[PDB]
Amino acid sequence: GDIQFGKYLRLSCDTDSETLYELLTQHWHLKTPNLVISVTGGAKNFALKPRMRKIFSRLIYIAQSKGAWILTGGTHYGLMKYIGEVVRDNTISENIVAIGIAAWGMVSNRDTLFSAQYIMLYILDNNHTHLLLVDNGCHGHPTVEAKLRNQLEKYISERTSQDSNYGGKIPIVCFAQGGGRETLKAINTSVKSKIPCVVVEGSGQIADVIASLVTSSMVKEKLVRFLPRTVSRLPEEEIESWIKWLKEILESSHLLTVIKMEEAGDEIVSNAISYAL
């Protein structure tokens, strides 16, 4: 049903990747010359620090300029609320789409639907226009939206469009400012696909760990100061996997790119994205 205080759909995780893109392309809106994927959910709180106050603001303007889609979690809590925030202000000030994919079972309130309206267990940001709720298992605590997101990204990457000036397939860029939890797994899975080229922001997180890196012993010293509570509470069975995953990312450093907090020069985001592509 539609959402208004705006469309939300509920689909199975096993659902085919193509059908999603076909529906979006055929009548809702025109073909996308660009796409951006943002990692989020590692920390519910998002700190509006001076560094983050500029990069995403420039990125959203770039997306509007290129007509790029933005793929975020879609919840009011976190970075996606500000990605939504800024998107709405751009419209207030040619059209920018914002797709948010979350877990259907992870949603506290679900209303069947003309269009059912709910006004304020995860809450959903109003700014994002389209919301996709994956339901592989009902009331399933574990998050499954990441798998469907990865499948959709893989399909879109293989999609071929003659438009624009990018050979064959349309461009894809993954922005990695959030750290740890689903962020590292998402980066690993995306890098597994050749087409995606990840980008790491300058914030203080495990993304900062990856930025600093560019065996297990070499990287063990890293992330200790950045995430003390995370490592201390994390069991050894989880810490070992966390440090194992970093090797896969560092194996292929050519695809990834680093945005350094230092450069005060404007449009750093554009330079980073263009270089990565």
Partner: peptide
Amino acid sequence: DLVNFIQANFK
């Protein structure tokens, strides 16, 4: 129409 299409997406 659109209503028929939407039903297919969920399956």
